[PDB]
Design a binder for this molecule. Structure first.
Ligand SMILES: Nc1ncnc2c1ncn2[C@@H]1O[C@H](CSCC[C@H](N)C(=O)O)[C@@H](O)[C@H]1O
Ligand code: NI
Ligand code: NI
Ligand SMILES: [Zn+2]
Ligand SMILES: [Zn+2]
Ligand SMILES: [Zn+2]
Length: 430
């Protein structure tokens, strides 16, 4: 089956890719991909529906496990062939049931291949079986991690799946690591993980021409730039706030390729991204190389500390790190912004609304200067600052920030996306 107005071609040096045949304007929808296989992240059960992802109050709990909710019984029955892979296992394993989301999603992919071997509507251009794996590029540490996931798959999903051999399972796992998507809500909060075959056919660019948004469990690809007939459709696979070197470190590590787009070539946004303090005695080169090294290393240590250190301690880390950095860097620097965004999140947990709003206010502007025009990160930030304002009863400011969020969202999600009608109703109440 073909996908209208688009075409799968051979992108030189980028393997298989998707190009446009007709023109697409900013905001236009390229295509929609129903999810081939998906799973709702554990920290969201009860909040969202396990079948359609609809966010609602009062959802039908599952009688057997009491850990899976639905809007009604049609969603419960419709989700059974997939939920049964964990209902009983969740009750029998109890506190020992902790498969990694990657393992859960892969189990669902195996169940899907068994129930529907034929090509699905989610595979009109690219098929799950023909996914790029990058297995020959794997080293021993990465092969060891894929081995731990195969051990988890067998350990938790043996009641129903018919596993092939380790050769086939390390391939599928490499394929999921290369083409698996993560679903986020209107605030970029993680909801789940899914497999979107046709969507996984678009290569990466740091200057993307399309954004992927989700309408429930449906992928929607909308043009954020003008796409002319014959030019490739490009998506951003990573967080575009960081400098070139950081971006490619993530691209090479996770996707086995070194981007070459205009941005990675000329590195225009790099300067402002690593703004140095216009001091009287401007910092020395080696001082900057040393500060970038320290910053990158503390990013990693904070990722590690978020797993056992109390919020007070984490906040102390963002403050002390921002202290030591503020001597070479400007607050617009992406490393100061990183520590600040993390601090704002910690305040959001502690329910220190005013502290979270203060940090947000400080972050938003540089955030706009660093990301593209239509960026889901910028929109979700405006959305968060807007709901912070409205919660605290700052109607004027909340209305301004919310309007900014709807500005970008109308392009990315389309003007009729339920998220937008929801924010508009959010403006008509406080
Ligand atoms: N800009 C780019 N430069 C080189 N390779 C790219 C690229 N963008 C995507 N890729 C390749 O695309 C894979 C992502 S899945 C995207 C489609 C892929 N080209 C395929 O034929 O199946 C990456 O692992 C990498 O191999
Ligand atoms: Ni996770
Ligand atoms: Ni991706
Ligand atoms: Zn539902
Ligand atoms: Zn259940
Ligand atoms: Zn790039």
């Amino acid at each position: 089956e073909g996908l209208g107005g688009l075409e799968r071609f051979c992108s030189p040096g980028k393997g298989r890719g998707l190009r446009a045949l007709q023109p697409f304007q900013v905001g236009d929808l390229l295509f929609s991909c129903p999810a081939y296989a998906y799973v709702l992240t554990v920290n969201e059960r009860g909040n969202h529906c396990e079948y359609c992802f609809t966010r609602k109050e009062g959802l039908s709990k599952c009688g057997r496990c009491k850990q899976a909710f639905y809007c009604n019984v049609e969603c419960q029955k419709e989700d059974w062939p997939m939920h049964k892979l964990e209902c009983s296992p969740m009750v029998v394993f109890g506190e020992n049931w902790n498969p990694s989301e990657t393992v859960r999603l892969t189990a669902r992919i195996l169940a899907k291949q068994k129930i529907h071997p034929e090509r699905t509507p989610s595979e009109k251009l690219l098929a799950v079986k023909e996914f790029e794996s990058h297995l020959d590029k794997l080293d021993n540490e990465k092969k060891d991690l894929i081995q731990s996931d195969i051990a988890a798959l067998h350990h938790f999903y043996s009641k129903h799946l018919e596993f092939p051999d380790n050769d086939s399972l390390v391939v599928l796992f490499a394929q999921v690591n290369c083409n698996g998507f993560t679903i986020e809500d209107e605030e970029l909060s993680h909801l789940g993980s899914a497999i979107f075959p046709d969507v996984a056919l678009m290569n990466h660019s740091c200057c993307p021409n399309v954004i992927v948004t989700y309408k429930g469990t449906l992928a929607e690809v909308r043009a954020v730039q003008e796409i002319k007939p014959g030019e490739e459709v490009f998506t951003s696979y990573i967080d575009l706030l960081y400098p070139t070197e950081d971006r490619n470190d993530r691209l090479r590590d996770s996707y086995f390729f070194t981007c070459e787009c205009q941005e990675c070539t000329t590195k225009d946004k790099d300067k402002a991204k690593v703004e140095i303090r216009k001091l009287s005695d401007p910092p020395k080169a080696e001082a900057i190389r040393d500060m970038v090294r320290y910053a990158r290393n503390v990013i990693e240590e904070f990722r590690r500390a978020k797993h056992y250190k109390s919020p007070s301690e984490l906040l102390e880390i963002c403050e002390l790190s921002q202290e030591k950095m503020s001597s070479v860097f400007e607050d617009s620097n992406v490393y100061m912004l990183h520590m600040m965004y993390q601090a704002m999140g910690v305040c959001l947990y502690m329910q220190d609304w005013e502290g979270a709003l203060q940090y947000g206010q400080k972050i938003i502007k540089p955030y706009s200067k660093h990301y593209p025009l239509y960026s889901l990160n910028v929109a979700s930030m405006w959305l968060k600052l807007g709901r912070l304002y409205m919660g605290l009863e700052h109607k004027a400011a909340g209305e301004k920030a919310l309007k900014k969020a709807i500005a970008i969202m109308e392009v990315a999600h389309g003007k009729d996306h339920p998220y937008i009608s929801e924010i508009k109703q959010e403006i008509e109440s406080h």
